[PDB]
DNA sequence: CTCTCTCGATG
RNA sequence: AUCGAGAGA
């Protein structure tokens, strides 16, 4: 199911010496408490500045991957760019302040937030749309 | 020794265009790049096959046995 | 020189202070200088050091430079290797070198010494002297062709 | 000196078949043919050939080494489809594709001068 | 037809420059091998010296003329000596044909391929004829007598695919290239300052649209134009250069669709 | 020493060695020639007697075959001439020397022999051609490259022998050595700067290349690791598939310098069980370091796995680099005009201040330094401004290179060249120096008939403002001349000074060992060591480890 | 090797489909790696590269001669006239999948030179071959049908693996393996074996029924006997 | 092409390799070591 | 004299060329058909048939460990720990 | 056989090192790999 | 005429001689190399041309001036062990064992001392299409 | 602080708490006793000396010192609870594990090390390129030089 | 005190 | 085989 789902605000776009892959700092437009990095790949969805991402993290939509066929398939998503990846470290800023870290095959993800359901699990999809 | 029937590189024949290239250098007055160029020689690989290569046979012919 | 000293609050802190380098060597008098400390006082001359510290100072000084030598190259050698060499050099009573008037004029087999150097002369020697060549070094079993007490020789395997 | 004859890089040996076919014990349903006396040329061209094929899974092939002309090709499928009908599926594609190329470039020829 | 599609820009008896279109990647490579090296053509395989008091080494002469073009129009009705049933070789897989030369003028006395004389019988099959694409009808310069120097020597030319040496090689260099404004980005172009001013503008960019600053990476392209040149050597003509590649790949096909025709057998 | 110490044997042979990136690491590349000269006697048993038996039906000349048949009354049967070459009943007991096969323990050594990885023990796979073909991570113990190095190979007789080769000096298990307390192999060349290109964050594989990198990987589940990008395209990164390479249960961690979990520069090293999170792979992991991925695969999982896991590695990135490319031309040696205008103006004020200093020194207001010449004074302070103008003019142009530079990415990656090589390519080779000091005075006063005398100028005493791309003048041609002489010199006084020290120690630490109380001795008995090392620890199975009580606050031990 | 030192054997050969090729169609006759440029600092080699690119094209001689004015700019200048990357650079495709090459390939003719060193000269291998006289050990060069000499330093390794029996292998039956008597009681190869009687005799201590059987090395009684020669006994007891 | 130089001894062709040595008759001036007697040394080689 | 089978005070462990030494002469005992005293199941190289027989501790070989002095503890192969 | 026809030879401070005099009389780079290095010249 | 002069090294200790004859004269190209102006003024002789201090083996080294002295050494040293035509009459000479390259080519990048040198006539290699190129890693 | 000691104690918790899943939000099913008498036993089986005398039983507690100090700062009860956060299944593994890697690390008998040590120290002395340092100190320091070259006099 | 091919003269 | 010479890394 479901696991995270919120909208953030693109506030930096950085390609650190790359020219696919940028790292994006956005922030919640709900939680003043709530902040987001993550390496994105501008190559296949472009991420200017100054953005309204829809981001969502769930746990499904192991198995050996099976080309998109036909489908014809419950794709679960009908999103704009997903990725798959592994949590990694759930850093304690505060009590009141709980991050956690993605690894998106090398694009790494830094999620701020306080209220979480995400456990370190291999199940980490990030879907992301408009 | 002689100049090499075919291009090394690709394999384009080029020991048929030797005397030819010496006529177009010694009777047409060209220099090298244009004879090579009207031999039809457009890469550089067999215009180097045929420039770079020296006619020694000429000399060894020069002993009687 | 600058030098890490435990800070009162308990950590570590850069403490540098003024260290006199010299060009000349005498310890036997330099030490007993009033002004310096006397316990930190070093020389690269571990012959000084054998001398004046003892046969043990000499040692640790005699590995310090050996260590010094192999990571001025920007080497790094584990410590037991090194560490033997020195002790061989230094478990005679003194400073024995790597050489033919050193560790060869040692009082182990004749073949042994035979097989470095001065070859000859040992036999010679050997000879004159009637030694007896107990057959347990290496190179003796090599010569004699005979599986030398090394490694999976270093024991007997019988039936029971 | 050591250097092997040159037609053994397209001449079958003594009892070398052309085909090996292998049951793949990793994955389900899969399959490894290894290709005698052939190079890129045809693995190239069939692996990429079954990839266009939907009801494949796995397509990939590799030569183990250039001495030897020869390369492993592994297949799986999905359920309800042997691998061999994907291979026999490719290769009849890969033929009229190149009839059709033959017959479209000798039509394109005869429109030509000098 | 319906599949693949092909558009001869230019055309001549040594070179075809042409379009290929809707085609994998894999079928183009693969084609350009094979027309490469994978394609029948007859070749001097054997040669008997006689006498050779040239000033060139014996097996140096042999070279050379392995080298030579020899017609290879009718060379699918001609036979392998590995397949023919014969002793050593015979009409039906090879082609003999001799040569003898020797100094007579005091000047240079150049042996050339023309004076190579067909001996075998070639019984109808267009075969074997030394290809001189030579101005003055000399052809291959193959070797230089003094005055008294002579070279008498037979050759048997067999069957053979230019994998198992270059010699049977049919084609020289093929042109090849897809994508000319790189916008597939399969190549990561290196610079100093410009990128576009320091590489030279292919000639196949007058063939396709110019990429806009405007518009997106295209991810879901692949790659369907490619432009290619197939220049012969003359043992066989250009068109069925590529012909007879495309029937040679086609029908290495089916050997390994027979293959698998015949693995059914219990 | 010539004939006890060492002797020349039979069953031996010597080739001209190449790399093979299909080999694995425990494997030698041997000639079919040489496999069908070198025998083994193989006793006739049961177990073996039909391959025995097919093998001398094959005879010489055509491998596997056999050379000779020893019978029961000890006579040698040449099977290469005999009558009864055909039929032989081969009764058990007798002996059948054959043709060396494939996995046949044999030890490959080359010369000069320096420590025991100059001798190794590889598994035989007889291939054609005539060059002994080894793995490239196995380069790095025999120190040899493929310019015409040539190596040696020794062939066991007994069962015994080939058993002491196989456990105890088999290539896998000389992995971690025990001079350094480190593995002595790991990914070099191509290897190292392919899986350098491959690890980047912008390095993206779709799904053809990723399947057959997959199926390129023999230890593969064949399970297809699910993509790092869904949509709008299946996408796979280089970390994603080079963790196929990687065994289960293998973690790592290391931080650089600016590395925070999130590591904003793709730098450092996270690898969670057989998986690597963050961090680009270059010789600081997958090379011969002391914490890398090869001593911990080795302790870990063992040394079989450890060579698995070089020819895997070796595979996979080899292979995407066969598909990739790389390169280098003269344009990776050519900085920006404005940078090297700064490169030429920092020679030149390099140069001003050298004369400055000259000029004081003339003028008798140099005042020395305390405990040397006024002469010394002068020659340290220009000799170490000229040394700062080519640290400086290289450090522009080293900065000036892009990411995309061939020479820095072969940096970057390790695989070969320095800083150095950067600074004197593109900006200034620097000061040429004989003896420590600068080009002296051969002629008098003077170092070449086109100066004046008494002329310590830069130029004159040997720095060369130009570099290799610029090209040197007649003088500083010369002067580097002497300089690379020098260099040359004192290299074969090194290796012969250090080829004589060498056997001086060996010979003084020969009989030398550690007997069943671990007390280290020699042939006496005496005593070198109570405990060998002082702690009786193997130093292959040791690592550097941190003793956190030593450091930090009282107030943080406590806490 | 080249005109610059760059020393190297063929690692392999490819035919000219397996060749990388530039657009134009043009395959390498060789292929060097570039890990071979920076440590080297071969950059002369490069712009002989170059130079003989445009010379090539050009059709006329490049002048590489030492000190000149002749600059890379020039020569880049030249060859981007004739219509190719200033700085030698192809773009080239892989001969296997037809697919472009990301990175760009240093490309263009370069004088290179084959030495005398060949495989098919240097290959040797003996198994079981001519000995010598005096010593009895293997005899030395590939003409010869020799064998190679398992120096002191290869000994030195086997010690450190702890490989005792190889080493024992080596050093006797792979090579000079010889059986000698010994009297029981001075300890020399004084004794005169009669074989085939069982008579083995001692003239000098009268022994026949006390006698000892050795295998040593040929060299190691060829030292016995020379250093008995030399007035010296090297008497060899078999007990502790 | 043959440029000569070189003799011709049983049918092999031999060349002298020019033997460098110290000049005769000149006068040098050489600082002895420290542990010797003497300082300085003026000598000269005659022919 | 002896050392008696208590009171030793060798490693217990079987050290590397203890193995290796044990293995190298049980397969050299197998490669003259000697009597196998463990199941087969398909090996035939006297050098695997002797690790397997080693592994089931089925080899009556016993290591004389000797001491500088001259003294000497024996350890059985059954005896003896396999930890490498 | 050009180099071999002007080389020198030199028999036993530093001969070995490339002295400033060498300078337009001996090549500074023609000279052997090893021991002989230095000692051997061309001109 | 007194145009030429021979030196050796005793004389040459007291002359100043000038390394180009561009050294006697009364907004650059940055490609160029940095070359420092004459300082001096009484010369007395002139080189005849720099490249002449080089050997007969260094003098086919293609930009000597740009490469790392002993790697110049090293080719100074392996040029000799290069195949080619040693001699037009090696048909006609009985030699204990020569190499002869079959098909020679005089380099593409050559030397003003290469003319005097024959290596233009007797060449001893050949002009190989290199590309340098990380690609099967054999 | 950084110092080769045998058996790599972090690797074989990182181990622990990746074998059994252990989570960072669980109360530890352990015992001061269990944890404290643990360490403090596991010392009693590192053995590099096996005798029954009072001299070899010194020259064992000598010979682990440095690695007990080790096992005894990594495995503080505060540390084991807190940052590990360990079981007592998984602890046990951890003390197995690490005396078992322990008796690994021993060195066997017939080593022999003279030779390994002349060699590790001469093979990297080739590939050496003010006082003076490098092949010719070291050719000094063997030779045991009558009068160095650089003899020099620190002075703190 | 310092692993290979090789040549070419010597007994 | 014994001594000199060239060369390989
Ligand atoms: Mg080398
Ligand atoms: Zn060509
Ligand atoms: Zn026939
Ligand atoms: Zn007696």
Same mark, same amino acid.
Request: aromatic residues 8%.
């Given at each position: ?130 | ?65 | ?160 | ?114 | ?39 029948? +053509? ?10 050779? +008091? +040239? ?192 029937? +040679? ?18 | ?559 | ?240 | 092409?043959?440029? #000569? #130089?070189?003799?011709?001894?049983? #049918? ?11 000049? #005769? ?23 | ?84 | ?43 | ?138 | ?156």
């Amino acid at each position: 199911n479901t696991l995270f789902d919120d909208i953030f605000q693109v506030s930096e776009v950085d390609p650190g010496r790359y020219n696919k892959v940028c790292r994006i700092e956005a922030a919640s437009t709900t939680q003043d408490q709530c902040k987001l990095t993550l390496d994105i790949n501008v190559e296949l969805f472009p991420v200017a500045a100054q953005d309204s991402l829809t981001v969502t993290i769930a746990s499904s939509l192991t198995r050996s991957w099976r080309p998109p066929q036909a489908g014809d398939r419950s794709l679960a998503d009908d999103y704009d760019y997903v990725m798959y990846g592994t949590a990694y470290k759930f850093e304690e800023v505060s009590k009141d302040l709980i991050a956690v870290y993605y690894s998106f095959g090398g694009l790494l993800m830094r999620l701020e937030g306080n209220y979480l359901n995400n456990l370190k699990q291999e199940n980490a999809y990030l879907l992301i749309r408009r | 020794m002689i100049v090499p029937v075919r291009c090394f590189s690709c394999g384009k024949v080029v020991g048929d265009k030797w005397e030819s290239y010496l006529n177009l250098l010694q009777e047409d007055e060209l220099d090298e790049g244009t004879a090579l160029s009207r031999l039809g020689l457009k890469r550089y690989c067999c215009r180097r096959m045929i420039l770079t290569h020296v006619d020694l046979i000429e000399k060894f012919l020069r002993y009687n046995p | 020189y600058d030098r890490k000293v435990p800070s009162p609050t308990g950590e570590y802190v850069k403490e540098p202070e003024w260290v006199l380098e010299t060009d000349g060597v005498n310890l036997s008098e330099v030490m007993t200088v009033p002004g310096i400390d006397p316990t930190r006082i070093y020389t690269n001359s571990f012959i000084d050091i054998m001398e004046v510290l003892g046969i043990e100072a000499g040692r640790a000084a005699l590995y310090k430079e050996v260590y010094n030598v192999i990571a001025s190259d920007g080497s790094y050698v584990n410590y037991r290797h090194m560490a033997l060499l020195v002790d061989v050099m230094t478990t005679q009573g003194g400073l024995t070198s790597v050489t033919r008037h050193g560790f060869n004029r040692s009082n182990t087999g004749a073949l042994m010494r035979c097989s470095f150097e001065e070859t000859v002369e040992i036999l010679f020697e050997a000879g004159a002297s009637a030694e007896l060549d107990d057959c347990r070094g290496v190179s003796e079993n090599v010569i004699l062709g005979q599986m030398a007490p090394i490694g999976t020789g270093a024991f007997d395997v019988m039936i029971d | 000196m050591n250097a092997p004859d040159r037609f053994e890089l397209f001449l079958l040996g003594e009892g070398e078949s052309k085909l090996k076919i292998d049951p793949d014990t990793k994955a389900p349903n899969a399959v490894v043919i290894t290709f005698e006396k052939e190079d890129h040329t045809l693995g190239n061209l069939i692996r990429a050939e079954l990839l266009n094929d939907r009801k494949v899974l796995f397509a990939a092939y590799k030569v183990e080494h250039p001495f030897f002309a020869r390369f492993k090709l592994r297949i799986q499928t999905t359920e309800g489809y042997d691998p061999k009908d994907a291979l026999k599926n490719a290769c009849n594609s890969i033929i009229n594709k190149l009839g059709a190329l033959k017959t479209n470039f000798e039509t394109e020829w005869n429109l030509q001068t000098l | 037809e319906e599949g693949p599609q092909v558009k001869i820009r230019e055309a001549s008896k040594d070179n075809v420059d042409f379009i290929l279109s809707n085609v994998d990647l894999a079928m183009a490579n693969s084609l350009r091998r094979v027309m490469i090296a994978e394609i029948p +053509t007859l070749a001097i395989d054997s040669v008997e010296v006689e006498t050779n +008091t +040239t000033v060139l080494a014996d097996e140096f002469i042999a070279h050379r003329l392995g080298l030579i073009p020899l017609q290879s129009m009718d060379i699918e009705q001609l036979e392998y000596s590995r397949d023919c049933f014969c002793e050593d070789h015979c009409d039906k897989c090879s082609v003999v044909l001799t040569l003898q030369a020797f100094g007579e003028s005091e000047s240079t006395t150049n042996v050339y391929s023309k004076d190579l004389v067909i001996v075998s019988n070639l019984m109808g099959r267009n075969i074997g004829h030394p290809i001189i694409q030579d101005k003055e009808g000399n052809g291959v310069l193959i070797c230089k007598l003094r005055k008294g120097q002579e070279l008498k020597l037979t050759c048997v030319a067999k069957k053979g695919i230019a994998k198992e040496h270059a010699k049977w090689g049919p084609a020289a260099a093929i042109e090849f290239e897809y994508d000319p404004w790189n916008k597939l980005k399969h190549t990561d172009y290196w610079y100093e300052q410009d990128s576009a001013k320091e590489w030279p503008q292919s000639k196949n960019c007058e063939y396709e649209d110019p990429p806009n600053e405007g518009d997106p990476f295209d991810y879901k392209a692949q790659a369907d134009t490619f432009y290619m040149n197939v220049e012969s050597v003359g043992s066989i003509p250009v068109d069925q250069v590529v012909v007879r590649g495309i029937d +040679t790949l086609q029908k290495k096909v089916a050997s390994i669709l027979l293959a698998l025709t015949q693995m059914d057998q219990d | 020493r010539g004939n006890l110490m060492g002797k020349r044997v039979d069953f031996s042979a010597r080739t001209v060695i190449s790399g093979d990136p299909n080999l694995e690491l425990d494997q030698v590349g041997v000639p079919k020639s040489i496999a069908k000269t070198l025998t083994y006697p193989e006793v006739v048993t049961p177990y073996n007697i039909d391959r025995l038996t097919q093998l001398v039906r094959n005879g010489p000349n055509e491998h596997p075959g056999a050379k000779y048949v020893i019978r029961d009354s000890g006579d040698r049967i040449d099977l290469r001439y005999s009558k009864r070459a055909g039929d032989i009943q081969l009764q058990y007991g007798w002996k059948v020397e054959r043709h060396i096969m494939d996995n046949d323990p044999v030890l490959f050594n080359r010369q000069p022999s320096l420590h025991k990885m100059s001798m190794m023990a590889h598994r035989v796979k007889v291939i054609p051609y005539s060059t002994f073909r080894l793995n490239l991570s196995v380069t790095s113990p025999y120190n040899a490259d493929f310019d015409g190095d040539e190596m040696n190979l020794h062939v066991p007789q007994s069962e015994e022998t080939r058993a002491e080769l196989s456990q105890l000096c088999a290539v896998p298990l000389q992995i971690v050595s025990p001079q350094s307390n480190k593995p002595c192999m790991g990914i070099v060349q191509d290897t190292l700067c392919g899986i350098r290109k491959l690890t980047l964050r912008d390095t993206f594989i779709e799904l053809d290349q990723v399947l057959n990198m997959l199926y390129w990987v023999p230890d593969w589940d064949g399970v297809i690791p699910t993509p790092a990008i869904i949509k709008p395209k299946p996408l796979w990164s280089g970390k994603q598939i080079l963790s196929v390479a990687i065994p289960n249960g293998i973690h790592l961690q290391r931080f650089d310098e600016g590395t925070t979990l999130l590591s904003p520069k793709d730098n450092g090293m996270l690898i969670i069980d057989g998986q690597i999170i963050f961090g680009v792979v270059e010789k600081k992991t997958v090379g011969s370091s002391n914490g890398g991925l090869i001593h911990v695969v080795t302790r870990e999982k063992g040394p079989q796995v450890c060579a698995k896991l070089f020819g895997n590695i070796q595979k996979v990135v080899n292979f995407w680099l066969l598909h990739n490319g790389f390169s280098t031309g003269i344009g990776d040696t050519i900085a920006d005009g404005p940078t090297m205008r700064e490169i030429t103006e920092t020679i030149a004020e390099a140069k001003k201040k050298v004369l400055d200093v000259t000029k004081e020194a003339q003028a008798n207001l140099l005042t020395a330094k305390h405990g040397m010449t006024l002469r010394e004074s002068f020659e340290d302070n220009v000799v170490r401004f000229l040394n700062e103008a080519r640290d400086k003019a290289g450090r522009l142009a080293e900065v000036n290179l892009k990411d995309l530079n061939n020479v820095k990415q072969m940096v970057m990656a390790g695989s070969k060249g320095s800083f150095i090589n950067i600074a004197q390519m593109s900006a200034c080779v620097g000061q040429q120096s004989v003896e420590g000091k600068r080009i002296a005075f051969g002629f008098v006063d003077r170092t070449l008939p086109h100066f004046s005398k008494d002329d310590y100028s830069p130029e004159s005493k040997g720095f060369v403002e130009n570099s290799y791309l610029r090209g040197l003048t007649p003088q500083e041609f010369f002067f580097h001349a002497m300089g690379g002489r020098e260099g040359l010199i004192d290299t074969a006084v090194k290796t012969a000074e250090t080829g004589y020290i060498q056997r001086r120690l060996v010979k003084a630490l020969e009989d030398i060992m550690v007997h069943y109380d671990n007390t280290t001795r020699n042939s006496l008995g005496n005593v070198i060591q109570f405990i060998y090392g002082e702690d009786g620890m193997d130093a292959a199975h040791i690592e550097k480890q941190s003793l956190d009580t030593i450091g930090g606050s009282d107030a943080a031990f406590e806490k | 090797a080249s005109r610059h030192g760059q020393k190297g054997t063929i690692g392999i050969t490819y035919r000219r489909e397996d060749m990388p090729f530039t657009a134009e169609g043009i395959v390498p006759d060789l292929i060097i790696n570039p890990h071979a440029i920076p440590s080297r600092m071969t950059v002369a080699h490069l712009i002989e590269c170059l130079l003989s690119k445009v010379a090539a094209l050009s059709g006329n001689e490049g002048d590489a001669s030492p000190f000149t004015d002749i600059t890379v700019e020039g020569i880049s200048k030249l060859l981007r006239e004739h219509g190719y990357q200033s700085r030698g650079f192809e773009v080239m495709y892989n001969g296997h999948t037809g697919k472009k090459l990301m990175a760009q390939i240093f490309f263009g003719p370069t004088y290179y030179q084959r030495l005398r060193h060949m495989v098919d000269d240097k290959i040797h291998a003996r198994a079981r071959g001519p000995m010598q006289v005096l010593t009895r050990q293997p005899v030395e060069g590939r003409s010869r049908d020799g064998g190679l000499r398992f120096g002191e330093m290869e000994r030195d390794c086997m010690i450190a693996h702890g490989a005792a029996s190889f080493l024992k292998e080596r050093l006797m039956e792979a090579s000079d393996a010889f059986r000698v008597h010994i009297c029981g009681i001075c300890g020399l190869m004084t004794v005169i074996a009669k074989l085939n009687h069982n008579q083995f005799e001692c003239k000098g201590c009268d022994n026949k029924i006390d006698i000892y059987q050795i295998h040593i090395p040929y060299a190691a009684k060829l030292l016995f006997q020379e250093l008995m020669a030399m007035n010296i006994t090297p008497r060899l007891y078999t007990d502790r | 092409f043959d440029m #000569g #130089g070189y003799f011709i001894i049983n #049918g092999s062709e031999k060349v002298l390799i020019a033997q460098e040595r110290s000049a #005769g008759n000149i006068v040098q001036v050489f600082k002895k070591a420290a542990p010797s007697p003497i300082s300085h040394v003026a000598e000269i080689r005659s022919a | 004299k002896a050392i008696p089978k208590d009171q030793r005070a060798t490693t217990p462990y079987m050290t590397k060329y203890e193995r290796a030494r044990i293995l190298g002469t049980r397969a050299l005992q197998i490669s003259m058909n000697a009597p196998v005293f463990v199941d087969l199941e398909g090996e035939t190289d006297p050098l695997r048939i002797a690790m397997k027989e080693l592994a089931e501790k089925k080899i009556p070989l016993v290591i004389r460990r000797y001491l500088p002095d001259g003294s000497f503890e024996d350890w059985s192969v059954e005896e003896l720990i396999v930890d490498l | 056989t050009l180099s071999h026809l002007r080389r020198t030879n030199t028999p036993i401070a530093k001969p070995r090192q490339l002295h400033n005099t060498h300078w337009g009389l001996v090549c500074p780079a023609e000279t052997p790999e090893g021991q002989a290095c230095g000692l051997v010249k061309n001109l | 005429e007194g145009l030429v002069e021979y030196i050796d090294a005793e004389e040459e200790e007291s002359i100043l001689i000038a390394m180009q004859p561009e050294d006697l004269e009364p907004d650059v190209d940055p490609a160029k190399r940095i070359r420092v102006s004459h300082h001096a003024t009484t010369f007395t002789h002139c080189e005849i041309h720099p490249s002449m201090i080089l050997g007969v083996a260094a003098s086919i080294i293609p930009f000597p001036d740009h490469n790392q002295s002993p790697r110049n050494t090293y080719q100074s040293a392996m040029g000799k062990q290069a195949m080619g035509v040693f001699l037009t009459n090696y048909n006609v000479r009985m030699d204990t064992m020569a190499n002869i390259l079959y098909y020679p080519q005089k380099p593409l990048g050559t030397t003003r001392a290469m003319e005097y040198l024959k290596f233009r006539e007797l060449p001893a290699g050949q002009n190989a299409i290199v590309a340098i190129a990380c690609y099967s890693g054999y | 602080a950084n110092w080769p000691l045998p058996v790599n104690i972090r690797r074989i918790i990182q181990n622990a708490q990746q074998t059994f899943h252990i989570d960072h939000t669980k109360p530890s099913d352990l015992t001061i006793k269990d944890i404290v008498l643990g360490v403090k036993d596991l010392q009693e089986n590192l053995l590099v000396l096996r005798g029954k005398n009072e001299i070899i039983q010194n020259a064992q507690r000598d010979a682990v010192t440095l690695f007990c100090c080790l096992l005894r700062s990594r495995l503080a009860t505060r540390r084991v609870l807190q940052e590990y956060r360990l079981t007592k299944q998984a602890f046990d593994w951890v003390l197995s594990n690490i005396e078992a890697q322990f008796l690994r690390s021993v060195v066997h008998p017939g080593e022999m090390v003279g030779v390994l040590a002349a060699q590790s120290i001469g093979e990297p002395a080739t590939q050496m390129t003010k006082v003076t340092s490098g092949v010719p100190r070291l050719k000094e320091i063997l030779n045991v030089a009558k009068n160095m070259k650089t003899p020099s006099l620190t002075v703190y």
